């Protein structure tokens with residue numbers, strides 16, 4: 001009858017129709033994901049386009065409802081979500097031009113390959129082949145050539161596309177009354193009108209800078225230690241006071257630093273924390289790993305999994321004619337259909353990834369009772385943070401002792417403790433400066449603090465300044481290295497991983513608060529105690545009905561982003577880093593480079 | 598659905614169909630045979646898993662309210678069983694639609710099969726109009742679907758007991774006969790007390806209950822087996838004491854003035870006389 005009653009009517013019809021429509025879209029997606037074939041991708045763009053067009057066409061009706069009339073916040077956020085046109089509100093030529101340029105990126109970067117200079121037959125793509133060698137190879141020339149060729153073959157093909165991309169994306173942001181696409185990213189945490197649970201857009205930059213100022217000394221010490229260990233592993237290559245080459249960090253761009261463990265192991269004469277060999281010993285398959293993950297979920301208080309997951313989802317690499325992608329992805333589909341794609345091997349990393357995606361789908365099942373477009377995280381980072389909570393809790397020795405591997409007489413000396421702390425710290429720390437530099441660099445590229453012919457010089461200068469990484473060879477304006485990364489060329493922001501990392505230790509402390517935790521934060525396991533279960537569940541289901549601020553103050557009792565849980569987690573390891581690097585230099589020099597000498 | 602002149606025993610019910618949910622809210626669940634049904638309404642339908650509990654007395658749901666309303670007034674049973682395979686398909690069975698939203702809840706024992714767009718303002722307009730929004734949204738019923746919308750087949754038997762010719766009314770177990778005994782008897786709802794014997798009286802086939810010049814019931818047909826039973830009233834006598842003079846002695850003897858020496862409860866010796874025992 002009234003404005004809000006008919007708004008609720010339209011939004012509930014939207015729920016009851018978008019349920020089936022997005023379920024059909026995700027069914028086509030899942031058919032493509034479990035079977036890569038042209039018929040599957042032709043199914044994928046039918047219902048997916050029908051879903052995007054459904055959103056636009058029902059936004060043309062939701063925009064007729066004025067937004068500044070609903071006093072409530074539950075349905076006002078639904079109206080906000082439906083009234084957001086997405087990426088279809090521009091001029092007719094330029095909107096489709098930006099879309100087809102993004103599609104061209106997603107094609108060329110993913111299907112690109114590099115070829116042997118002396119043999120134009122040896123050609124291989126990025127994953128696998130290039131990431132496995134630059135994670136374990138000891139050859140400078142091989143890693144350097146792969147690192148150069150991946151950014152040469154497709155980085156050039158992405159540079160003019162990125163040049164058009166920044167302009168068209170900024171035009172789209174301006175058409176949606178945003179400052180830039182950096183402001184669009186800052187607009188993901190944009191709650192309004194609450195007066196106390198509110199959060200601005202520039203405050204995202206404020207918080208990121210202020211909470212990375214504390215990371216900077218810890219990351220400086222870790223960078224000093226990894227440079228010393230790279231001296232140990234790759235002698236006569238790097239300056240003792242300089243930065244690090246970009247092809248010695250385990251991955252393509254220096255994002256993940258876990259692979260350095262084989263060459264940055266503190267005390268190798270001690271039992272290994274990696275339990276992949278133990279998992280091979282008992283001849284486990286994927287099914288046993290996933291069932292043990294579900295059992296650990298039951299132990300902390302989260303429910304079992306439904307029939308659809310074990311009846312529909314793909315769990316092992318096919319290999320045969322029904323070839324399919326194997327990236328670990330959680331899939332929210334509605335109708336009780338919450339799926340996971342992982343081609344799982346017998347690996348400890350795969351065990352923690354299984355826990356990661358189990359946590360994602362448990363989060364999805366918890367918030368499944370939400371309205372359809374509120375069937376998502378309160379913000380972007382909480383999904384990833386909740387997923388990583390289970391990996392972080394399961395990685396502790398307190399969980400491996402209860403798994404069944406690692407016979408239950410495990411010592412508690414500081415040696416393996418420090419080893420595990422450093423092994424986790426490589427990834428946890430070294431992903432933060434890269435996130436900071438990438439997010440700020442893209443923010444100011446979209447904002448305009450970099451002239452369009454200065455992208456690479458500043459990008460690598462702040463790889464040196466923030467991350468302490470030097471490109472081994474000079475780069476002209478021809479290439480595009482940031483666009484040669486998965487998240488830049490596939491429309492994904494990167495600050496969500498920073499939020500994941502900080503909320504990860506925040507939720508660690510929160511879940512150890514009620515779990516009668518006795519030692520420091522590193523040994524804490526959330527297993528066998530269900531109180532952490534409901535303490536995380538009073539998070540696990542709110543969705544976008546309430547802001548992340550109310551949810552975060554209910555979880556940890558804090559109002560703003562904080563990394564102090566991480567600092568206290570690594571503080572004994574921080575002292576260990578300070579003690580070990582007394583014969584080396586703590587810091588990095590941005591003037592040194594392998595091509596500058 | 599109305600059923601007639603039968604038992605509806607639960608044991609035979611179990612073999613034909615197995616109910617994941619088998620609960621009578623308004624009546625006894627197990628004794629579906631005991632209850633004497635008249636104009637029973639056995640209401641069969643298919644709903645998603647969450648809608649199974651929604652359609653139940655004491656719990657009001659939009660799917661329940663606007664499709665098949667269950668207020669507390671009826672006495673009835675919810676019987677749900679898993680029919681995911683038949684009611685769902687990988688392509689998706691859009692056969693079933695739910696009225697997720699409607700102006701008002703259905704009246705008791707009221708049906709609406711209408712597919713007309715719901716009017717948020719309360720004034721129905723054409724389906725192409727933006728203002729009118731359709732209430733019937735297709736079920737999400739897939740083989741791939743999870744328990745959230747998994748199909749289940751539910752029948753609610755809502756009935757007004759003895760509000761019509763009684764039709765589903767379990768025949769109780771019969772203590773068929775007793776011979777030459779003063780007991781109580783029930784000829785198919787005809788209860789009395791007396792001694793029962795076989796009856797050598799040829800009742801006209803159409804009539805089953807007898808009567809006498811004394812106006813009492815000589816005989817009546819057994820319902821379970823159409824054989825006639827003679828009825829006689831139970832023995833009643835007047836105990837009368839014989840004694841010599843109390844001065845002469847203290848011994849006595851008793852006379853039962855109209856019964857043979859059989860039925861006396863019983864004194865060492867008994868002697869049957871034309872008078873009595």
Ligand SMILES: *[C@@H]1O[C@H](CO)[C@@H](O)[C@H](O)[C@H]1NC(C)=O
Pocket residue numbers: 820821822823
């Ligand atoms: C009732 O059924 C029993 C079982 O066969 C049979 O012996 C009896 O004659 C039947 N009586 C009537 C009246 O149908």
Ligand SMILES: *[C@@H]1O[C@H](CO)[C@@H](O)[C@H](O)[C@H]1NC(C)=O
Pocket residue numbers: 844845
């Ligand atoms: C009982 O009988 C005795 C002897 O015949 C007699 O003496 C007595 O008076 C009698 N008493 C009565 C109450 O009849």
Ligand SMILES: *[C@@H]1O[C@H](CO)[C@@H](O)[C@H](O)[C@H]1NC(C)=O
Pocket residue numbers: 855856857858859
């Ligand atoms: C009592 O029983 C005897 C022997 O069975 C029988 O002759 C007599 O008729 C019975 N009494 C009556 C009143 O029928």
